[PDB]
């Protein structure tokens, strides 16, 4: 299968174009749109990057041309670790549906944020806040595709198993792509020599939920989280063997681009996944 990776949040990390141009990637999910919902302006953030202000963050659609026509898939990110996003009521999902239809998808916006380049669906990292209509918003954005192209939509849940924020849209079938972040989550993540808690939870999730391709979520570098951390021997020894026997199999998601490089993650398991 291919690595997904976690583009936007360290300003030294390289620009998107550079990211794409590294030929490790068949995924690019840009980190994030953490404030949306109940009547506040949409804000993204994408560290130091560039601000988002007067078009700062225009010069992203190159990036993204770039990544298109070497076929690799990006999606904007909803939620995060940080961030005041939420939905109030079913209204509110149709309102942010529309809002990111126009601004990140095929609808039009004067004040696109990331440029005029349209992206190729939604990922959504929502990790606190209400449990209620994010399974709305996934169909209301579904129903986009009607008009013509479609809008891929995929979901980093955290390992266990069903996950509080993100269970109830899981189980629509509407999404293509699932990584599981399988990080800072003791009961479902690598330990030390335990390789089973980890599997065992990969058994749940690929038996379980009804999505086109699910994902190893890891950490880069043991900086990039708290926990979860599994160095390149082990996964590519261990746990690979194991989880490409599964047809959902897809691959491996990785967070940070900024970690990967500084740990060099990619270039150690890019050809067994
Ligand atoms: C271990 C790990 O990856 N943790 C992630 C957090 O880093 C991340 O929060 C973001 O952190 C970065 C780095 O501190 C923030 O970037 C700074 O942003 C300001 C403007 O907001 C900019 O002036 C700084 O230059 C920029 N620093 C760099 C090096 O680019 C960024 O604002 C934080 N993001 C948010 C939403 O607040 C969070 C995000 O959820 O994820 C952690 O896992």
Not at 97 to 109: R, T
Request: glycine fraction near 12%.
């Amino acid at each position: 299968g291919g690595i997904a990776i976690y583009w936007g949040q360290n300003g030294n990390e390289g620009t998107l174009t550079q990211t794409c141009s590294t030929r490790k990637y068949s995924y690019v999910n840009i980190a994030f749109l953490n404030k949306f919902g109940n009547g506040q302006t949409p804000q993204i953030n994408l560290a130091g990057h560039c601000n988002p202000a007067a078009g700062g963050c225009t010069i992203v659609s190159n990036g993204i041309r770039s990544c298109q026509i070497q076929g690799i898939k990006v999606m904007l990110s909803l939620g995060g670790g940080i961030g005041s996003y939420t939905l109030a009521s079913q209204a509110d999902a149709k309102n942010v549906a529309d809002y990111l239809w126009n601004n990140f998808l095929g609808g039009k916006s004067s004040s696109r944020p990331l440029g005029d380049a349209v992206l190729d669906g939604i990922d959504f990292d929502i990790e606190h806040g209400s449990t209620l209509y994010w399974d709305d918003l996934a169909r209301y954005l579904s129903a986009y595709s009607k008009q013509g192209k479609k809008v891929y939509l995929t979901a980093a849940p955290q390992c266990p198993f069903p996950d509080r924020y993100l269970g109830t849209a899981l189980n629509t079938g509407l999404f293509d792509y699932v990584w599981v972040q399988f990080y800072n989550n003791p009961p479902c993540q690598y330990s030390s020599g335990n390789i089973n808690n980890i599997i065992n939870s990969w058994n749940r999730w690929t038996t379980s939920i009804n999505a086109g391709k699910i994902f190893l979520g890891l950490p880069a570098a043991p900086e990039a989280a708290g926990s979860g951390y599994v160095p390149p021997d082990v996964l590519i020894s261990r746990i690979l063997p194991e989880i490409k026997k599964s047809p959902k199999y897809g691959g491996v998601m990785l967070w940070s681009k900024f970690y990967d490089d500084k740990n060099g993650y990619s270039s150690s398991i890019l050809d067994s996944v």
